[PDB]
Each structure stands twice: as structure tokens, then as C-alpha cells.
Amino acid sequence: VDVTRDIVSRERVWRTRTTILQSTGKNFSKNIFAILQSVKARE
């Protein structure tokens, strides 16, 4: 109905699900994938 688009337009979402999982700092995964490959070097 008009109420649905009427509300979901005017509000805002600053807090979702997905960026909870993502960290507020910058933690890249190269270090993570480097040790991922390093344990594979033990394999």
C-alpha cells in the first residue's frame, strides 16, 4: 500500500545486519590468507 512506500522511503537505515559482521576497523585478510597458505605449506 501507499503506507509501505510512504514509510520505507522517508526513514533511513544506518545499522544493517551485514556490516555488523564487517569490522569497523580495517582488518584485511592477506595476513589471514598468508597464514592460510602457510598452514598449507605444512600440508
Binding site: 533511513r12 537505515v13 544506518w14 545486519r17 555488523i20 559482521l21
Partner: peptide, 25 residues
């Protein structure tokens, strides 16, 4: 003593639920 205390040791992992921040017009 002879052996340690028994446990079902697991490296579990929890999940946050949906936040539902109060909305911003």
C-alpha cells in the same frame, strides 16, 4: 588425577541477530 576433567570442547561461533535500529526520518 589420572585424566583431566571431561568436556565436549568445541570452538563454537555465535551470530548477532538483526539490530533493528530505531529509524531515521
Amino acid at each position: 588425577e589420572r585424566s583431566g576433567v571431561v568436556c565436549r570442547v568445541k570452538y563454537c561461533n555465535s551470530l548477532p541477530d538483526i539490530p533493528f535500529d530505531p529509524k531515521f526520518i
